[PDB]
């Protein structure tokens, strides 16, 4: 095939042009996102039942929905939470590769049939099914700098004016309002209601009667009379529009004639549908829109479009309204992509420089400069074909594959130049001879690298999804590089290279280049002499190889494991948890203290703080809060102490002195869609209807047992809330009947006053808005206020709650958990340092085996995937080893010569480990893929050396030792120059300390170490392996 | 204004009409609830009476020759035609007295759109028309957008249905020609191993 | 039994608010009638899988379903693949004139 | 000349065919009744059938 | 999957019209074979459960 | 695969059964499928040997 | 079993084996539907079936 394109250079140029055009089209059309879909598809069902505790929601909503989640395909598991705020969230997690749309529609349809079984209030509020397996692309906050607008006002303005156009922006998949529209709030005064013998039931009935849409009919409607000429639609009672209309609602008329209006016994205003959450941006009231990226969309273009649309909106805003960006990771994505592209470009430039340093020929240096970009563009086209996007994993995979690409180009060009300078043949015939020498080796290398890299794509779960990006990217780049080395590169060598003399090795040159040529010739002579000396005493170096292998095993065993490095993305979080029973005001004071610390003690590092009082992590209540701290640009934060690591630890140390509140600052996970890399996730299941108390007892026993093993388990804690005091109202039903008070009226009054009641809708400025009736805050604060509320009896007398009900204080769960339809409790932990996660999970299982009867357990989250993919790697890599051996045997026509190649694998690996051991890095995904690339490059070099030696032995009468020496002599230069090019290209990644430096260091350090040790060792270990193998099996 | 401008060009546009309905009059009924309660007639009764008599009310199902069918109660036509027929309909009170609608209701005339259209989430109006004999639809669309460019601020236009496809085809024709020419050139260069024959 | 403006405010705008972010959607056209009917057509790109588009439109609609008036849920909100042209008209007459 | 001819050639999408069927839409003023529409429709039917 | 989706999309139009007792029992839409894949029985060897 | 998943679920449930409760399989066609496929594989091996 | 159960006077009792594929049924069997397509009723349909 190489001979075909040497005679047809224009045809090869046409192929290269087609590849370039395809790659360009892909680049213009590829999606761009920080990460691909890594988390398994997940569907969340959210429902709200206002005014109810956790147990009420669980018994009336959660269990009913869970019992109907049947017949849904590819469901891995299901979990649910029922909070004391009246909210239930049910997350159904499905197998990887499941169509998210199909799973979502199946869940929604099973919930459609279960809707009639839910309370009428849940049906009225609505149950929403959403895809929760993604995260926000951006958060656009809106503040007022004048203080003239409350949080509700800003939220209503954003809903009415901003949300629709932002949703219509291209690339925007979902927009979530951080707030709510206006709602007609009726704050009832119990004293005024008792004055006119009224109850919340009367208010609700009056609102329903006097705020409604009534179908009226039509004038001259069909069937008409024989002479009808006019046809008009009849309009009748329509929904109210303003607070004035609602205040004019008539509740009763007294005998004296005085009218009782809704304004008399209640305050009418436009408030928020909910008040649980209070959002502040640097201490000012704020609302916001969370924007998710659409599937197949470009993150950078979508962010630019969103910002442009916001700029277009800005001139029409009310005075004082300002746009901010509390949570924006798009700058981090942009800088990361820029860093990777710069790495590629400087790698190409460094390859050019090394080509010119070694060959001292300009037209030779162009050939790789044309080959490598063509292969990269073809790789982009292949990624587009297979439905991949431009993300961190694929971009770093391309960065890793640069080594193999430049190696192929360098091999072809350098071999052609060597043939030209040795046999003195003109470029065309020299290229023919070189390709005849290396074509079979290149094909075998392609097969071997496919065997090495393909098995990564067959891992299961989220980790499998991560390694499939690298697998596809590197395999496609390698295949395109090999095809280019057989199609375009030989044609370029034949058409562009100038002839070289039969014996010109560069010693005749002057200046730096002549000295370099003489130095390299003498170094090659010394290296060949040393290699011969080694081959005379191969046994000692075989012992040395055994030592190297043992050290490799040592370092591999003692290297810690991880998934992805943490990154300084310009934002981090601070969670505040107050004691059970704490109120919104206390949490707000704690959050204000946190914000003051962040904006005063870290004013050079922190741009803004977005404090959200009302929900945190694994809970939502008045005693929890979360603050999203955005950092200044990395340029404005120079040094180790100004990064997220140091800043977060300083913040945690400062907050440790806060009393009556646990405050913790921490960095984001590498992929926010999964909070993985925090050990193990455990579920303790009530399998025999034991109850909440017995489940709590079992969980306490398990935690106590786990605390007795500090050497294996660290920070084993519950992921939930402890039982909190609750105020029990025992309504004496016989007394209620005796005094002529209906239980329905009692319950309606209690719930509406203290819990709030949604009544119906009203049309405000052309938008439907909810109408809520609740007690004025003054009269629903303390137990004594219960005595301020009266209920009318059939006789017409207002009876107080004390006449037919008692009260007391009990204990109850503010957050009830379920797993797979059964009551459960979630336990988080991690293995002790120096311990693997698998053995920690084994110890947890052993401890759980000794728990009370009827208590089971399960593994969820990352533990479930770990159990799914625990044993996959050894089997797939054994298959990879077998396939590599078979391919090498096919290439060499021998069953034993392959071994001389396969023994090179440790030589690189050890170095990587050392580089990972000294720098303090861990065995993460980037380290593993870099290790694979180093192994591939080492195998390529060994394959070329062995091919040259065996060709000398077979096609010529040269002996084993002589052939080995001549082969290493011929292969030294390309090996050294490729290693130099790749090491220089990855130097920036190793030295990187700015944005994205975690991933860059993880990718670069292992590659550097492995390449250094592979180049140093293989050049005189591969000949040893070849000679030993040929001596044993001959 | 756009339709009037289009009518000035009979030689290019023909049968230019709006695909919509003009604003229609509507009869608004104001039911005074406090008067109804004073007279002892429930508001729900009044609403049911008005809706059933004038708008027709679907009660429940019956069986006709084995098929489930609807049961409707509605006023007879002659008591349902003119606005002054409202007075003939009475509603019983809590004491059994029959109260007229005039005793607690008034009425007026307003105007409203019987069909409101939106395109891409914004209010819109659909216009239909043809190209005059001897003219092509491309020329008709060109003239239509020329006329639309002279409309007040905040009033844009767009093409939908057949016209959207025609616009897309016209827009993407030149790129199709260029790509096809490049592909043929590259194929010739590949086959005949020369840049000369492809150019010639 | 609702005006075109009222049904547009209560139904059409609420529904079409969440009809954004669907794959391969070329455009959307809606209308609201004086009889309370709301008719919203979403035209997608040629070659789009109509089944997947219908499923996605359902997934986006179920977010707005609770926000519609109770009478709308009672009448039923239908999402289905649609065409704008009649394939054929099959009329039925009575040649005896005995049937109205 | 080729460029000149190309620029001046009017554009369309697809030629219109005689498919043996066409439509006639009728719209009366706002508030018109079914009987007036029936009268107009009866006129159209008469035109085509006479 | 799509067949079940369409069937339920048509069934949710009739669901409001069904008797309330029918709705409270739970209407089910399923895509299964007409024959049992298996039968998993449960007994009590001690005989202490009816 | 569905039968295997059901058996795994029943195995998960079994440790928490009340004393005396026990699972049976009064109707399972899976053993027939297993034995039939195994018999055909055996015939293939014996054909190779012959 | 069928011969023994034919002596049971209290019921129609039949033992039977399933086919290779349940849905295919017997290779010589046919399934027929008699439709009331004029609103005749249940009794007239019964008479026609008889
Ligand atoms: N609907 C309630 C009302 C207010 N609203 C606040 C949001 O919590 C905004 O807070 C953030 C900020 C950044 C990220 Cl990434 C996330 Cl997930 C959440 C919540």
From Swiss-Prot, chain D:
Induction: Positively regulated by MarA, Rob and SoxS transcriptional regulators (at protein level).
Disruption phenotype: Loss of susceptibility to contact-dependent growth inhibition (CDI); inhibiting cells still contact the target.
Full protein stretch here: 551 to 600 of 1049
Function statement: AcrA-AcrB-AcrZ-TolC is a drug efflux protein complex with broad substrate specificity that uses the proton motive force to export substrates. (Microbial infection) Involved in contact-dependent growth inhibition (CDI), acts downstream of BamA, the receptor for CDI. Its role in CDI is independent of the AcrA-AcrB-TolC efflux pump complex.
Sequence similarity: Belongs to the resistance-nodulation-cell division (RND) (TC 2.A.6) family.
Compartments, as annotated in UniProt: Cell inner membrane
Subunit structure: Homotrimer, with large domains that extend into the periplasm, interacts with AcrA and TolC. AcrA may be required to stably link this protein and TolC. Interacts with AcrZ. Part of the AcrA-AcrB-AcrZ-TolC efflux pump.
Name of the protein this chain belongs to: Multidrug efflux pump subunit AcrB
Swiss-Prot record, chain G:
Portion of the parent chain present: 651 to 700 of 1049
Organism of provenance: Escherichia coli (strain K12)
Induction: Positively regulated by MarA, Rob and SoxS transcriptional regulators (at protein level).
Family (UniProt): Belongs to the resistance-nodulation-cell division (RND) (TC 2.A.6) family.
Protein name in the entry: Multidrug efflux pump subunit AcrB
Disruption phenotype: Loss of susceptibility to contact-dependent growth inhibition (CDI); inhibiting cells still contact the target.
Origin: domain of life: Bacteria
Compartment annotation: Cell inner membrane
Subunit and interaction comment: Homotrimer, with large domains that extend into the periplasm, interacts with AcrA and TolC. AcrA may be required to stably link this protein and TolC. Interacts with AcrZ. Part of the AcrA-AcrB-AcrZ-TolC efflux pump.
Function: AcrA-AcrB-AcrZ-TolC is a drug efflux protein complex with broad substrate specificity that uses the proton motive force to export substrates. (Microbial infection) Involved in contact-dependent growth inhibition (CDI), acts downstream of BamA, the receptor for CDI. Its role in CDI is independent of the AcrA-AcrB-TolC efflux pump complex.
């Amino acid at each position: 095939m190489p001979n075909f394109f040497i005679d047809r250079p224009i045809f090869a140029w046409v192929i290269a042009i087609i590849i370039m055009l395809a790659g360009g089209l892909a680049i213009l059309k590829l999606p761009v996102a920080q990460y691909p879909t890594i988390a398994p598809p997940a569907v969340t069902i959210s429902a709200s039942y206002p005014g109810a505790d956790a147990k009420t929601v669980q018994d009336t909503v959660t269990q009913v929905i869970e019992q109907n989640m049947n017949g849904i395909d590819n469901l891995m598991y299901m979990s649910s939470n029922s909070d004391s705020t009246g909210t239930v969230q049910i997350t159904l997690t499905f197998e990887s590769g499941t169509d998210a749309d199909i799973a979502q529609v199946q869940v929604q349809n099973k919930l459609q049939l279960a809707m009639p079984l839910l309370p009428q209030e849940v049906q009225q509020q609505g149950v929403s099914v959403e895809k929760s397996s993604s995260s926000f692309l951006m958060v656009v906050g809106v503040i007022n700098t004048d203080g003239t607008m409350t949080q509700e006002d800003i939220s209503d303005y954003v809903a009415a004016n901003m949300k629709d156009a932002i949703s219509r922006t291209s690339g925007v998949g979902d927009v979530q309002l951080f707030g709510s529209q206006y709602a007609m709030r009726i704050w009832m005064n119990p004293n005024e209601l008792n004055k006119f013998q009224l109850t919340p039931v009367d208010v609700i009935t009056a609102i329903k009667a006097q705020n409604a849409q009534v179908a009226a009919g039509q004038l001259g409607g069909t069937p008409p009379v024989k002479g009808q000429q006019l046809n008009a639609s009849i309009i009748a009672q329509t929904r109210l529009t303003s607070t004035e209309e609602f205040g004019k609602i008539l509740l009763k008329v007294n005998q004296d004639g005085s009218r009782v209006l809704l304004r008399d016994v209640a305050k009418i205003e436009l408030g928020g549908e909910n008040y649980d959450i209070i959002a502040e941006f640097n201490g000012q009231p704020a609302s916001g829109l969370g924007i998710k990226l659409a599937t197949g969309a470009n993150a950078l273009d979508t962010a630019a479009a969103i910002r442009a649309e916001l700029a277009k909106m800005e001139p029409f805003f009310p005075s004082g309204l300002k746009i901010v960006y509390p949570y924006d990771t798009t700058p981090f994505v942009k800088i990361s992509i820029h860093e990777v592209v710069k790495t590629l470009v400087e790698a190409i430039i460094l390859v050019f420089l090394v080509m010119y340093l070694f060959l001292q020929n300009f037209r030779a240096t162009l050939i790789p400069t044309i080959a490598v970009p063509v292969v990269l563009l073809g790789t982009f086209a292949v990624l587009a074909a297979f439905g991949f996007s431009i993300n961190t994993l694929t971009m770093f995979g391309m960065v890793l594959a640069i080594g193999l690409l430049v190696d192929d180009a360098i091999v072809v060009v350098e071999n052609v130049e060597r043939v030209m300078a040795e046999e003195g043949l003109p470029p065309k015939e020299a290229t023919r001879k070189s390709m005849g020498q290396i074509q079979g080796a290149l094909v075998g290398i392609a097969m071997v690298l496919s065997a090495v890299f393909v098995p990564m794509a067959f891992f299961g779960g989220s980790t499998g999804a991560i390694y499939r990006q690298f697998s596809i990217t590197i395999v496609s780049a390698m295949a395109l590089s090999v095809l280019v080395a057989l199609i375009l590169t030989p044609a370029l060598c034949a058409t562009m290279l100038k002839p070289i003399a039969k014996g010109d090795h560069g010693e005749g040159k002057k200046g730096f280049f002549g000295w370099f040529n003489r130095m390299f010739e003498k170094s090659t002579h010394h290296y060949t002499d040393s290699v011969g000396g080694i081959l005379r005493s191969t046994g000692r170096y075989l012992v040395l190889y055994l030592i190297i292998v043992v050290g490799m095993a040592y370092l591999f065993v003692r290297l810690p494991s991880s998934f992805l490095p943490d990154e300084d993305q310009g934002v981090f979080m601070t969670m505040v948890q107050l004691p059970a029973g704490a109120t919104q005001e206390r949490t707000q004071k704690v959050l204000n203290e946190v914000t003051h610390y962040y904006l005063t003690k870290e004013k050079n590092n922190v741009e803004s703080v977005f404090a959200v009082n009302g929900f945190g992590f694994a809970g939502r209540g008045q005693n929890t809060g979360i603050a999203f701290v955005s950092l200044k640009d990395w340029a404005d934060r120079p040094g180790e102490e100004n990064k997220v690591e140091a800043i977060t630890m300083r913040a945690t140390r400062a907050f440790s002195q806060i009393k009556d509140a646990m405050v913790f600052a921490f960095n984001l996970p590498a992929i926010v869609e999964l909070g993985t890399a925090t050990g193990f996730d455990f579920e303790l299941i009530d399998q025999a209807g034991l109850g909440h108390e017995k489940l709590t007892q079992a969980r306490n026993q398990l935690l106590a047992e786990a605390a007795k093993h500090p050497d294996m388990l660290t920070s084993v804690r519950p992921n939930g809330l402890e039982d909190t005091p609750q105020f029990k109202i025992d309504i004496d039903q016989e007394k209620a009947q005796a005094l002529g008070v209906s239980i329905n009226d009692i319950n309606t009054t209690l719930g509406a006053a203290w819990g709030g009641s949604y009544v119906n809708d009203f049309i405000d400025r052309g938008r439907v808005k909810k109408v809520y009736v609740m007690s004025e805050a003054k009269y629903r604060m303390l137990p004594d206020d219960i005595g301020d509320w009266y209920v009318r009896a059939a006789d017409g007398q207002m009876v107080p709650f004390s006449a037919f009900s008692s009260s007391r204080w009990e204990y109850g769960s503010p957050r009830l958990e379920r797993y797979n339809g059964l009551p459960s409790m979630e336990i988080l932990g991690q293995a002790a340092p120096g311990k693997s996660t698998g053995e920690a999970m084994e110890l947890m299982e052993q401890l759980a085996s000794k728990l009370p009867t009827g208590v089971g357990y399960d593994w969820t989250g990352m533990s479930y995937q770990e159990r799914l993919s625990g044993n996959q790697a050894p089997s797939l890599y054994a298959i990879s080893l077998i396939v590599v051996f078979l391919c090498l045997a096919a290439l060499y026509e021998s069953w034993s010569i392959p071994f001389s190649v396969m023994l090179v694998v440790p030589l690189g690996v050890i170095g990587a480990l050392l580089a990972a051991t000294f720098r303090g890095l861990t065995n993460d995904v980037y380290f593993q893929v870099g290790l694979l690339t180093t192994i591939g490059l080492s195998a390529k070099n060994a394959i070329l050396i062995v091919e040259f030696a065996k060709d000398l032995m077979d096609k010529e009468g040269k002996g084993l030792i002589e052939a080995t020496l001549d082969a290493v002599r011929m292969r030294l230069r390309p090996i050294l120059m490729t290693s130099l090019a790749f090491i220089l290209g990855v130097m920036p990644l190793v030295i990187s300390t700015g944005a994205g430096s975690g991933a860059q260091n993880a990718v670069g350090t292992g590659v550097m170490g492995g390449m250094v040790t592979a180049t140093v060792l293989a050049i005189f270990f591969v000949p040893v392996f070849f000679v030993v193998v040929r001596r044993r099996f001959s």
